[PDB]
Amino acid sequence: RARRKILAGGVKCFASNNRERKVFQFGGYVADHMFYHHGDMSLNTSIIKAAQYYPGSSHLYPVFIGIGSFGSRHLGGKDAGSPRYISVQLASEFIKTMFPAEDSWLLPYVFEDGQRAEPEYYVPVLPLAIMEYGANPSEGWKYTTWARQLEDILALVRAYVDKDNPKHELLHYAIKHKITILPLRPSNYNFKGHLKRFGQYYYSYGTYDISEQRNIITITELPLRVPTVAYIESIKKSSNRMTFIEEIIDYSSSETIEILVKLKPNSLNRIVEEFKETEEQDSIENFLRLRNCLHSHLNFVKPKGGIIEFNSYYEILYAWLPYRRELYQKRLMREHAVLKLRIIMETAIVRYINESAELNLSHYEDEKEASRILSEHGFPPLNHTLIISPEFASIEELNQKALQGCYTYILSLQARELLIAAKTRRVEKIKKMQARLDKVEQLLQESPFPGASVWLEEIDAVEKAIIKGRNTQWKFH
Amino acid sequence: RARRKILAGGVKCFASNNRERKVFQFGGYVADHMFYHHGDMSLNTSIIKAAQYYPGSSHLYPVFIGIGSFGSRHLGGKDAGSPRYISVQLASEFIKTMFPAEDSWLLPYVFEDGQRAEPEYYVPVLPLAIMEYGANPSEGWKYTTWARQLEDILALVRAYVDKDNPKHELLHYAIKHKITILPLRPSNYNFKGHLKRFGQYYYSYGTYDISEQRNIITITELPLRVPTVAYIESIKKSSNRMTFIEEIIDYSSSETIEILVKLKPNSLNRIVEEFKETEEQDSIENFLRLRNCLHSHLNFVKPKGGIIEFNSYYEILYAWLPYRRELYQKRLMREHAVLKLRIIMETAIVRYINESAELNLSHYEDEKEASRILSEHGFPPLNHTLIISPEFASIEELNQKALQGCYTYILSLQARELLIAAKTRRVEKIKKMQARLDKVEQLLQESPFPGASVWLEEIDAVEKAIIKGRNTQWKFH
């Protein structure tokens, strides 16, 4: 959607350098290049929604580095500051690990009006469609979904990649029968409460502290995805519950949650005699609206177009994995296909120096008979500036336009390129890149799927960026 | 002075293209590069003073193309418009003919604070110190001088350059004896009046029309360098002359001069009986203040610093000519000195191709023994990027840093540069530039002074630009 359009903005604008840039200036850059026609206000509110960093925000891991204060959990991110004064900084450490730079050249790009457009879907290292809560990037309709923890999806992806996990074939066994033996639990970050499961729904409950010595009721934790100001007004609506409430004063603050509630003890003995004495939970969390109903609404973009609904989050992770798994194979094969062309081009230039002024002379090179005469000389007619600089080209298209290439990679070199020292660096470039070919040849041949070993390293790289961001003051340095 | 600082602004800013630019934007460019620290207001009023185009203006030929209206002859150029709204355009046709581009590399540049500064004086094709009236580029003190016509200085410069003029040695004879037989007269552009000479001063007089049939006095032409509004208030000061003036109403307008004066005929018979009956001129131009005293004030910048005063304008033209004449010799000698170095460099590369893979091989070129081994090979050790790209270097400095040059003009060429077709274009480049050397060698050898023939062509080029500007609507196209 529009989120992916903003994603290409950070990497393209900050390709030269990752410095501090204004939000509106970056927004103007994004619409200038990727043709954002929905207005800068819609772009600016989407940038903040993409870069929101607060408990309860939809985006747990922002694409960009949070600068200044974008709000607080009280209003649920609706108290954003002035876009003009605030600045935006791309998180270069996370974005390259989460989205590999080399994989971007292979991503399926659509073309609109004869120009490239952003991909329909991205296939990152970890699925961004589950790690983030639902939100309202547009107006009117709001998508509602709940994120899973960063320990169950990690165990699931490592089970489908690493062979060392004992439950490797067990996960594969569950794929065919759709039994889903492995667990999968909601996010628990910045929620010191409880989560309880009956039937087919979840409910989040807060924490309250009761002290007999001082007869003061203390509320510790809020529900999972509630703004603070919402609970203030919701408790005032019920006239029946207002009679029991003599007074509620909020003492909670930012980075320090402590609420003092003065409730008469004589009201404690009569609340339970008229609230039917629910046995599922205590009356303290029943009289106080400290619960929310989690109606799982699942939406995933269809590859062919449209929207799909899944009964559980397992069907999303079990569907996101194969598309990422498939493109690991294509990434290595294309890189394999370009290294072998580089060996052909480099060796020809190295061997050209042997048939240069060292031993032989063929300087005449009339453009008419240079075609088939040089054919028996072994010099390949491959086009230059493509092998050294690969582009958004598929494996099938790469071979067609490389074999039927053109000259000027030969006999257009600098006169020093055929000197004795230059050949030594040129010939030694082959073996270093020949050894890299061997490792890739050694890869892409495992029984489960190609590129399994590199997947684990990429998974760890994502974890390194997330840990460093949280360990530091969200500075990544 | 500050005028020459603005001069370099137009050529440098409009080197890429000659388009329409705002006056203040150009002023910011000038101060940014040539370090104008007198303020933009002083710069802006100097730009308009440099680009003023109206009868009576100090600058007859503006450096830039006049855009819009900068005022009128009524206020004498003090009614300039808003600098921000008006635009400035460099007159590329005139400026290159008046100031040769190639001569700029040889002009004496001073260095301040380790950086280049504008030349102390310029030596253009025609002397700008006489063709323009005096003005007040600064505040407080105003320089007063009167320009000569564009037919007497042209006859004088052609007499000192062209041998076909019968009064060639006559001018040279007048130089030693300071007799100045040749004439020299003031400017007569846009002045349909009279100029009269007694003693050692000039006086400009207007034209009046008297009709007996209608008994209406008509004034046709104003004095040479008078604003229209000055004459309105000056005639009101004299109380004695106010009695005779029953009423004066100005009917003159822009591009149409016609003034109706109603004077009673009975006052005509009594003005002459009390004004002493001056015989030098009629009483009509005596009662009406239609004359001005031309006190010749001559100021010329000293080459060593200071100001000089000359008794006549002849001493200025007879002093400006030798400095321009001297630098014609230096311009050709430097261009002669760079063509002969270009022949050495190009022939070596052409002959290098002969000792390239065609016949001989010397590709080893160890950096230690390439010094004296290649010395017997005839390859000159001249530094590249200097002959092909000359800079602000004198003839004496050019030879010192060219003979003691460096390599990389050899054996760093493209491999196609030693191909058979490339040598043909390279060897034929020698003879075309050898023929140009012959003409320069044929020049700089005349008895009067070097570069006499090119001077006449440059003089005509200046005349072509001036004629085209006046023939068209001051558009030069």
Author numbering:
A (entry chain B), B (entry chain A): 716 to 1192
Give the published text.
However, for these theories to be broadly applicable, they need to be demonstrated for large and multimeric enzymes that catalyze complicated reactions. The enzyme used in this study is a type II DNA topoisomerase (Top2) from African swine fever virus (Asfv), a dimeric multi-subdomain enzyme (271 kDa) that catalyzes multistep reactions to modulate DNA topology. AsfvTop2 has been found to be involved in the early stage of viral gene replication, and also detected at the intermediate and late stages of infection. The domain composition of AsfvTop2 resembles that of the canonical Type IIA DNA topoisomerases (Top2), including the well-studied eukaryotic counterparts, which form homodimers. The catalytic process not only involves well-coordinated changes in protein quaternary structures to allow timely opening and closing of the N-, DNA-, and C-gates, but also ATP binding and sequential hydrolysis that relate the dimerization and catalytic activity of the ATPase domain to the mechanistic steps of the cycle.
We first performed the cryo-EM reconstruction of the full-length apo-AsfvTop2 without DNA or nucleotide. The distribution of the three primary co-existing apo-conformers is approximately 1:4:2. Even though such differences are modest energetically, they do suggest that the closed state II is the most stable state, followed by the C-gate open state III and then the open state I. These thermodynamic properties are reflected in their structural properties described in the following sections. The results from the preceding section suggest that, even though the global conformation of apo-IIa is very similar to that of EDI-1, binding of DNA/inhibitor still induces small subdomain reorientations, yet coupled with substantial catalytically relevant conformational changes locally. On the other hand, as shown in Fig. 4f, the three ß-HPs and the catalytic Y800 in apo-Ia are farther away, relative to the corresponding moieties in apo-IIa, from the catalytically relevant positions in EDI-1, suggesting that it is less feasible for apo-I to bind the DNA substrate and undergo functionally relevant conformational changes.
